[PDB]
Symmetry: D2
Subunit: 476 residues, 4 copies
């Protein structure tokens, strides 16, 4: 941490760069979390200056008047380099610009690819070919999409593998940076009270939920090509499945943890359409932005088939999980914002309360209002002896009010400086993900089934509820 | 419940009768919980009138101005009968007074013995000999002490057994009427989340705690004869042990439940002095009432040996519990009021967090501020990955604010009308209790060891803490 | 054991007395297992002599020439007393005959009732009224049938309860005296390897089997009144259910054990006809004694409905067993002699051998050729990797060859001298047994359904197999 | 399997080649287990002919007169090639000799390295450089030793990794080819009866035993350089530890299985000398070959320190195993031949048999007389109620008599043709093995402690027994 570090924002000119990456690296700098000797270098097609990037990005910093001195130090340690994405000369200028930086030939190089997936191969080759420290380490941060299926992801993933070792590749699933998501492991493996119950003997099912109350909101053109499954299920929701299901690792080292995650996936068969319900939101007449359907987006092809809601049931066919359905439910334009892990436990054996009991559930609400609670039965207070539902809760907000939770990107980026791959997608992890959904996704493309309509603002298709019931979920 | 009931307060003239029993039966009447056709009959040595009892007791009723009509109906359904406790004629007048009551020869008779233990034999014989309904049922409510040891309790208990069947005898441990105490069963057998963990594989120990911040406060003369163990441990604390430890019964019928309780006790060997630490409170110089010791009570014999604090460790030598110490800790003049069940779970197997973990605990606070919470580990919020202690809680007060909790005596008495023995001490239950402590208690009487002093307002003798540590409790 | 004991064979003149009881008490005497000072007194209607009883019974003794001295000592310690069963004078002579015996007024009195059930009340009253030692203890041995249903059994059982305390009543189920039957407890509670698996998580079902290859063989007249259920299922098979299912007791004391047995039963609902298949054997044309059906017995009413085969499924609705069917299968004139406990375990979770696995079973063969074995899977020996069925066995015969196993009656009678009720039916035990089958038995009497025919020498009705399959047994 | 295969015995001239490899490949050929179109090619320094190799090896074949036709076909499909081990020309002749073989350029090439470890690098390079099929697959079989410690093994292992992919490298631990050793997985994962008990809650320890009744018997010169640990413990015994301890894999694919094995090892800390007892055999005066010690070998350096017996205790620090000692006991010149896995289960909770119980054990005897049995408690047969030790056994010999068990090398070699790496040591597997023992082995070399003497024919040092006792083994 006494070494010089260079943080290279590739695609500096872009919106992600201006709205998220620059301010994220400001907040780590601001808070004194980065190495002392850190430089930021933007690179993009445009011919820009640090001055111009500051105008673009400084609105987004949430900067105060007492950070004026820090803000200027920060911009002092910024520079820019105009260049093209497959132009070997451009990378030459970039590499010697970096070398000209205080101890640049020594410095650890960190490349954030804030760019569309179409330039990834170009960029990763050029970086490898001409921008790599000879002394320092070189890490590369990459966002999704990682291919569109197993075949496309493999093409990309072999390219990069040919160029970089796994310990230089940091693929991002930003859910891996959320407070409650990271906390899953601690909940499970720090506590004895959650050990003996975490298996097929006690859990009737697991429900992994992703919901947003807004639709595609203008930009449904980008979405139409991807779909809800690819956008949210194959990545975020399955990451959570993995943390929920993984065996306990020997250590917290990055690859012991990821070995367990990938082991979970290897245990899961390809999804059969039989277990999938799809949905597409239509407008709501009885309601501004909610009045339009998915299709009333001008950016979305007429008569499109793309699903904005998917409910899918998976199985982890191993000793601990066999037969226990994992229900993955996701969609946009729904009744709420929520991201949630919910385990529904089995009924109690030998009931002595004449069926009045309700299944216990452990609930880890990821957002909003981060909390982890158990729904359980207690004797109805007062002059009664009938049990009733209640819950023991750890609601972050009451318990920890003062504390401010860092943003996923703040956490993750810091891990790249610190070298922790634990919270980043590995290549095997990545391909197991693709082989689980790939047959279904080709099917869909091939058979192009009409999603089930769902009115904007509802909980999604009734048929999704019907499915969950069929594999042994219980609504109460 | 359409039958006439007579509630006979034996010892009506006494303080318990005036401070607790009369007002308790008022509150059940007030709230419309008793049978419509209920009569209250006081019986005591004094020559009194309903008028006099009303003057004595009505202060204690918490009566309002809108209950004026109910208060008069209540006193209308009262009467008194002056009589002596071993005088056959007195019981004759009482029995025909009862007969003269609307359907008195039919009426179900309920006898509350609000009397010292010295008259129990006299009274129960006379009642049986001359006061028993021929048509209705006859139940008898009895409070402690039930003997002073196995031998004395057996003498009393054979007397009453000769006279009444078990289903006519309602022995009271008022702890059995507390909200959280009753709730133990529902916590355990309604929930799956507390099933798999409730055994020797997961629990390192159980701590059953009884504490009061006041001393004997003048009346240490009555206490000196009994001692903390007999006063609190042999009854209340062991009742809780039983509810904590009992196997799940087939049904909630009174005798299935009590079969399980008595089964637990049969599994417990006699306490050896080796596992007992005793204590006697001395005054605190640095503090009104706290300035005096136990011995500075004028009502307490000079140089007494009686213990006001006892810590004892027991074992339930069966499949589920073998080796798991149950720590019973009790005493007066301590740092707080608390009654509490605390299970301390074992460490987690295969720790991956470098010893930073702390043992989980499940805590059912009986009083004050009734609650049930789990102490567990959560990932330290914010930019950390180190677990820290936290808890999920169900605090009655936040969750159920509006609800008012009935008093133990309100609950129990109602059960006597309804005929539920589930919450009353059975004779076998009673004698198993005595055989567990009887050898120790005779020892004490015989060897009269000097209790360990403890300053008023402290947590009790350090040596108690030393003991708990020795059998595998962990302070953190 | 230095006291005088008198063993009173009531019904000495009868066949059971001559074929079993006399020789049984000879073998205990022969082997030096009885108290030194033991007398045998026969009592029956006939006017007999010790000489006559010796002629009747000595054939059955299996006596050798070196036991000549023991045989004469034995008959020396015999006497007889002619008397009637409800004649107060007869019991007077019997009681003073006993008194005239060396220390007879002191001697412990043991009454074996080798008599039909119709005289039980008469006999037990007279014994109590006039034959009871004032100094020694008095025990009474009683065989089935104990009533024909709950109501009749209660009448008998209240009679005897009025007269004798439970610790004087020794009701017999001779299955309780079989080597493998007694061994159940040791198998279960001595071994750790059979603890964790003994519950609803691992056992798919339990099959308790009773079979005989012979029919009623002439005496089907006595049987017609009783039926297979009453004859074998309500007693023997359910005793085995109890030993299989009971929780572990605290100690091996007689009443801790029996408390657990009766606890199991209390947990079982009344059998519904829905779970019962009945059978009656018809003759086999293709085969001496096997050529006749049940009905071709001259002693059996024409067109009788009595079942010689019953398959019934029961549930023990508690924490450990809930949902696990206990299949009780019994019948006469079947393919073999066998008495057997067979637990069929569930499939393994997360199968890695492509369905080639078979459910494990633990098997305790009670008779013939006493053994306890596990059927399990082993890698097919040789150049293979496919698992196949095999078994680990403890076959008594190979392992213990020299040892001769005492007869049930030898064991039990000795327990009556030693005072061990552990292996005898208690009154609560008895009535729980009756309430489980009583509704079904009245039904049958009322609706008189035609049993399903089954050819002599077969395994019984196909429909029985169909039932077992329906509640989750698997034939492989 | 319709392809041509070439089996290249490198070091054909050697004793292993003549005594084991040639006859092994004969027996697979003889039994029709190899591909139809198989050629055998010997290569060694000597200038030999097929004729000469046949003279050398045919004694060892166990050939009959009816295999005369098969024996000639076999030798017809043999050839030889004289060559040196680092001579590029020699490999050129070998590669074109192979090409000249019916479809040789197509044929799958199988290289058995029947050679000392000193030529491994030379040979594997030359093979890679010039002998590799362009069409067929090329596999290489390699025996131990694989380095002498982590550093030496890494040098070798990086060499070969540079040249060949893991799926071309077949490292041998011949224990992996033994019937009972392979059967471990089936025992564990095919059966439910061994699932719930296979963890730290039920197992007090595991004892992995290797013993031989003969010493080094002349060739103690080769041994002196290696030692018992390196010779037997680091490989065979730890392989068995792995099969005993591994989590259940998702599938039986080679790398799922090996992932679990290597996962076990990663969970094991480096052995501390504190847990090691070492031994060296001295002669026995009271006994031919047993009269000499290790040191009385002329081939062994005077005053050597090498251990012929090692007892070591290891821990697998994970959820399933934490705290359960794995006792590895091995040595030569001992009281017997035995290779054995023995699990000793914990005592039963809540003993009701007054300490008469003994710990249960599951025993898988690998050799001699292959068997798997459980030692357990049964009620002492006859007129007793005291439990005693007994066992349920599956003894191969009684149960499977006719069947002949193939030799480890027969099994393994066949797997190389079939392409199953499941039973071969992987590189990670290999290095985890080395890091566990490497610190201890350097210590020993450095501190050269004097092993504890042990008389030839005994069970080894008393101190080994003392150790086992200290970590919670119980001798009974
Ligand atoms: O819940 P978050 O943090 O806002 O992230 C959800 C978003 O994550 C992105 O990965 C998806 O592409 C978006 O479709 C989705 O809306
Ligand atoms: O906690 P509670 O409800 O006030 O009861 C505690 C009291 O209960 C009584 O049984 C004891 O005799 C008292 O000594 C004790 O103080
Ligand atoms: O199997 P055992 O020991 O011979 O006993 C079976 C007999 O036991 C008796 O109880 C039954 O009345 C008979 O019907 C039955 O045949
Ligand atoms: O038990 P097995 O099959 O004969 O193998 C034991 C031999 O295996 C070899 O690996 C060891 O080098 C020898 O020292 C050992 O004797």
């Amino acid at each position: 941490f006494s070494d010089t570090h260079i943080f290279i924002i590739m695609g500096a000119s872009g919106d992600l760069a201006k709205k998220k990456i620059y301010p994220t690296i400001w907040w780590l700098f601001r808070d004194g979390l980065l190495p002392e000797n850190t430089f930021i270098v933007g690179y993009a097609r445009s011919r820009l200056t640090v001055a111009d990037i500051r105008k673009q990005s400084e609105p987004f910093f949430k900067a105060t008047p007492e950070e004026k001195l820090k803000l200027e130090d920060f911009f002092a340690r910024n520079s820019y380099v105009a260049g093209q994405y497959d132009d070997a000369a451009s990378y030459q200028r970039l590499n010697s610009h970096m070398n000209a930086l205080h101890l640049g030939s020594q410095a650890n190089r960190l490349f954030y690819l804030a760019l569309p997936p179409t330039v990834y191969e170009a960029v990763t080759k050029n970086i490898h070919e001409s921008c790599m420290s000879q002394i320092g380490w070189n890490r590369i941060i990459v966002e999704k999409p990682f291919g569109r299926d197993l075949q496309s992801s493999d093409r990309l993933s072999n390219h990069i593998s040919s160029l970089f070792r796994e310990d230089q590749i940091y693929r991002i699933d930003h859910y891996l940076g959320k407070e409650m998501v990271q906390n899953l492991m601690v909940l499970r493996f720090a506590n004895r009270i959650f050990g003996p119950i975490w298996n097929r003997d006690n859990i009737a099912c697991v429900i992994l939920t992703f919901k947003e109350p807004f639709g595609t909101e203008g930009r449904g053109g980008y979405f139409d090509e991807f779909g809800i499954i690819r956008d949210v299920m194959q990545n975020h929701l399955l990451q959570m499945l993995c943390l929920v299901a993984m065996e306990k690792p020997c250590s917290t080292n990055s690859d012991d943890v990821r070995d367990e995650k990938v082991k979970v996936l290897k245990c899961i068969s390809e999804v059969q359409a039989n277990n999938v319900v799809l949905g597409q939101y239509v407008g709501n007449p009885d309601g501004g932005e909610a009045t339009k359907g998915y299709l009333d987006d001008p950016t979305v092809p007429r008569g499109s088939t793309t699903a904005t809601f998917a409910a899918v049931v998976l199985y982890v066919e191993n000793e601990r999980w066999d037969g226990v359905p994992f229900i993955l439910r996701c969609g946009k334009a729904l009744n709420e914002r929520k991201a949630e892990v919910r385990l529904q436990f089995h009924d109690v054996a030998g009931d002595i309360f004449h069926q009045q009991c309700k299944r216990n559930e452990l609930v880890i609400r990821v957002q909003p209002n981060e909390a982890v609670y158990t729904k359980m039965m207690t004797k109805k207070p007062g002059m009664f002896f009938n049990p009733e539902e209640s819950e023991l809760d750890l609601t972050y907000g009451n318990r920890y009010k003062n504390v401010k939770l860092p943003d996923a990107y703040e956490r993750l980026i810091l891990d790249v400086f610190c070298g922790s791959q634990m919270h980043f997608v590995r290549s095997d992890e990545l391909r197991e993900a693709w082989r689980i959904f790939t047959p279904l996704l080709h099917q869909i493309e091939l058979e192009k089934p009409k999603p089930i309509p769902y009115i904007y603002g509802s909980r999604g298709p009734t048929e999704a509820d019907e499915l969950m019931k069929r594999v042994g979920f219980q609504y109460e």
